[PDB]
Amino acid sequence: HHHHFNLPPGNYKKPVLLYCSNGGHFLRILPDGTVDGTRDRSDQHIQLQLSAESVGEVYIKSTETGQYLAMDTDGLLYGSQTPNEECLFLERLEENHYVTYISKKHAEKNWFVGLKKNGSVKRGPRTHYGQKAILFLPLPV
């Protein structure tokens, strides 16, 4: 395929917080489908549950609202009420430590889930290997 296959510790038993090392925000999916980041560890919308569709492919869903993280045709993240092709991400280890999530639908273009230092999500085309915005550390709740 288009990417390596170094995988991070596999465990989707319980929910996690996706902490972004670039700014230290937790990924958040709001009820209205908006996706962004917040530093508030107590936010009810940052608790996420990952599940593996195929080895190395995951869905990322809000435990509070049931929404699936998804990246659209123009690279914007949104919360989807139902699982679709835009909701699958390739979960990969990076720098032998961090976890990156690559849009499966747009894998050939290297579009990643990423957060800026100001807490706003990055648009797919603006992401790329080597950025700090793409580096996550899932924290078990």
Residue numbering of the annotated binding site for heparin: 22
- Supply the DSSP symbol for 137: E
Query: What are the φ and ψ backbone dihedral angles of 3, each rounded to 5 degrees?
Result: -135, 165
d(CA 18, CA 25): 8
Task: Return binding residues.
Answer: 22
Helices then strands, counting H and E runs in the chain, come out as 0, 10
Task: Give the three-class secondary structure for 61.
Answer: strand
DSSP states of 108-126: GGT-B--B-TTSPBPPGGG
Q: Can you tell me which residue has the tokens 């807490």?
A: 119
Supply the DSSP symbol for 67. Answer: P
